[PDB]
């Protein structure tokens, strides 16, 4: 009954996969320096690194929050570790990205409450919406400056 969902962000590949594996490990244990070790093991600089981190954090907290058995696990003394890593590392401590990511931590982003009653396509629409939000925040690019404002 633990038939989990697909992680569509491995299209990036072999540098998102490593950091998402280390974020799932830092989900299961409590040491968070492993994420920093994976971040110094990567090319594709600060926007792409931040996009990898935010999508890894999303896919772990989303696959946790949706399933009824393991709901709200980082509240069990574990949001302190990832939030101290947020307060320390400047790779994701940009205050608009940071106020987005804190909202993703404590489930107060109003995209998870998307209330699509299809319950199959709801997963896909949530994933594309948080993907484009990660790209619009992390992307400092002219051809995303209208749509970010949109």
């Amino acid at each position: 009954d633990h038939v989990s969902l697909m992680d569509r962000y491995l299209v990036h590949g072999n540098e998102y996969k490593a950091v998402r594996d280390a974020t799932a490990k830092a989900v299961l244990e409590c040491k968070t320096l492993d994420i920093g070790n994976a971040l110094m093991a990567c090319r594709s600089p600060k926007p792409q690194q931040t996009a990898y981190l935010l999508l890894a954090l999303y896919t772990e907290v989303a696959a946790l929050y949706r399933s009824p058995n393991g709901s709200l696990h980082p509240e069990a003394k574990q949001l302190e570790a990832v939030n101290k890593f947020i307060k320390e590392s400047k790779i994701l401590s940009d205050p608009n990205i940071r106020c987005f990511a804190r909202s993703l931590v404590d489930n107060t982003l109003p995209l998870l409450k998307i209330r699509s009653a299809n319950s199959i396509l709801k997963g896909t629409v949530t994933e594309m919406a948080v993907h484009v939000a990660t790209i619009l925040l992390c992307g400092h690019n002219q051809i995303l400056k209208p749509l970010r404002n949109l």
Binding site: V3, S4, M6, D7, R8, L10, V11, G13
Partner: protein, 75 residues
């Protein structure tokens, strides 16, 4: 995209789930109650394929320079 289909076929938590093996790029011969290895019971013979529609034809026209070479079909 076939390399991307290979990558999405080989993530290490769905690959144990026997539904992506009977669908997304693995031979179904691990299911033991089955007819033997015949010339007609290969996996590619029981694969899926497209249903050719008008919009796909328009897509093929847009790749193959339909505004220049084949103008009547494009219009």
């Amino acid at each position: 995209l076939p390399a991307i289909n290979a990558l999405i076929s080989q993530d290490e938590r769905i690959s144990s789930n026997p539904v992506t093996k009977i669908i997304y790029g693995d031979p179904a011969t691990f299911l033991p109650h089955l007819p033997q290895k015949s010339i007609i019971h290969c996996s590619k013979i029981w694969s899926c394929r497209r249903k050719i529609t008008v919009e796909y034809l328009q897509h093929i026209v847009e790749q193959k320079n339909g505004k220049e070479t084949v103008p009547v079909l494009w219009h």
